Design an enzyme around this catalytic site. Sequence first.
Site, PDB file in Angstrom:
ATOM      1  N   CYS A  11      -8.206  -7.907  -0.801  1.00  0.00           N
ATOM      2  CA  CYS A  11      -7.546  -7.273   0.281  1.00  0.00           C
ATOM      3  C   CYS A  11      -6.862  -5.984  -0.005  1.00  0.00           C
ATOM      4  O   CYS A  11      -7.087  -5.039   0.711  1.00  0.00           O
ATOM      5  CB  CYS A  11      -6.655  -8.137   1.106  1.00  0.00           C
ATOM      6  N   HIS A  26      -0.677 -10.424   1.080  1.00  0.00           N
ATOM      7  CA  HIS A  26      -1.817 -10.012   1.870  1.00  0.00           C
ATOM      8  C   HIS A  26      -1.475  -8.571   2.244  1.00  0.00           C
ATOM      9  O   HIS A  26      -0.310  -8.161   2.511  1.00  0.00           O
ATOM     10  CB  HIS A  26      -2.017 -10.871   3.197  1.00  0.00           C
TER      11      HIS A  26
END
EC number: 3.4.19.12
Lengths: 166, 395
Positions: free
Chosen positions: B14, B343
């Site tokens: 990510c 994230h």
Amino acid sequence: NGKLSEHFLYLAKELNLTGPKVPEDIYKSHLDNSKSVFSSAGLDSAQQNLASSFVNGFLNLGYCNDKLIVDNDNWVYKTKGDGMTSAVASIGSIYQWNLDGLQQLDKYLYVDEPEVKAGALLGIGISASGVHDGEVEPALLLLQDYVTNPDTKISSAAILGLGIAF
Amino acid sequence: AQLPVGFKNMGNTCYLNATLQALYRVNDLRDMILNYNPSQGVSNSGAQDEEIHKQIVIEMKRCFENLQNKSFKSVLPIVLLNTLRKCYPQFAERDSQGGFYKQQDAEELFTQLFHSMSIVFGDKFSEDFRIQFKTTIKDTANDNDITVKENESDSKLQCHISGTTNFMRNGLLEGLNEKIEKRSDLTGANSIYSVEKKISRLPKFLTVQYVRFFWKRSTNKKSKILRKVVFPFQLDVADMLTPEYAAEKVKVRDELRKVEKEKNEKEREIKRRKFDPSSSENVMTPREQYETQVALNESEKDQWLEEYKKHFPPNLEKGENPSCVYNLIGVITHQGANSESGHYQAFIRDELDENKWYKFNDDKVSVVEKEKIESLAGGGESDSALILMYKGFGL
């Protein structure tokens, strides 16, 4: 008719008035009031290019003047495919319930594509409905000849046409 | 040009995705990367990892070409990641599924990438991120002692948001007041120094790095400074600029204003055409007309950028911004205080309409507004900026 025709006070007025000829005539008076339109609806391009043509027909229900729009051969040849067939039939729907406007259709009947010949015959059906016992321009006069032509599309429009008009 | 799209994810990449799209959107940077061929080689033979640095750059080429493509949301980051592990042992770290890499600090990735381009191009890449400072070093207790550095410089500016902050704007100010101490009392005591930087020379491209990761001592955990920040779409830096440098920049900015208006004039005239149907051309979908117009627009926009650059004075030096204003093009936001398995999300300003932004949540594309990004409260309530990428106006 025959009872009336035997007495013979007048032959013609009674035949007309029993027949559907007087129903054509009263409408002519009416149109003027409701106002004769050349109005069309429908959009350009793709499968709407086909539509717009047809739709002018539907909007000009019954007997109406839309003579000048029809007079352009441009719009008619601009239709594609089987849609060409439906275009010429719908010109008959401008002139629905009335002989007058035959002349435009007859032109298509001789010229170009097999498709427009079938269309011309169907539309002549739709128009000649305003007769069946006036016996003034019979459907039969036009419609016999194309049964004989063995091409399936042409004949089919034509023998359905006979069914509607009388 | 062509619209940006999904960037292939595969788990624990990510952070890696977000940073790569971010760099790509800089117009200059993209081209130099596209125009990179191994024939031109490294521009510095000062590095024993000179060959590896070429290889990274090439894999980013791959990614960029595919990113642009509306077709390909694949970019194949499987190989790129492998290469990164060899180059730098930071990226070999952290146990995970498949290889060993996991989620990381996008800050760490960004510094390392930076050197990679720097070695291959040389000084050209560098000048486009060099910040000069006239730094005054005054002991709070001994103000009388003032030691001046004029040649102090850095590639990157830190915004400290520790200490009273409520905005990114406030934090840019606090960031100049780094504090350092000095064992010498020949510089006047072992007291904290006020360290005050003014920027005397801007770079074309400005990198903001939030400093905020720390071990919160009292809770014995990783944490990050929770204090609210809010990042306005338009940035202006006129106050931090030393007066003398600032005047020149305000004059330059005016030529730029003229082009921005002719660009937005002919833009409106596009929207009208599409609005209307295609009318006669007969048995055609409207769509075929429409695609053509979309193509014109992307071309016209690159053309307008080139006009700003040509009009700039030949007095202007390469590696200086023309102006004091910058436009926000990319936000790497972070979520979760841990970055051990936090994230990363990416917001990328749309090309075809600068007004619009694409939120790339990895592979998955959703449309958001420029406003939505302004309305953020930042902190942990919502996604909040860790790296901000700012582009000189008109470049």
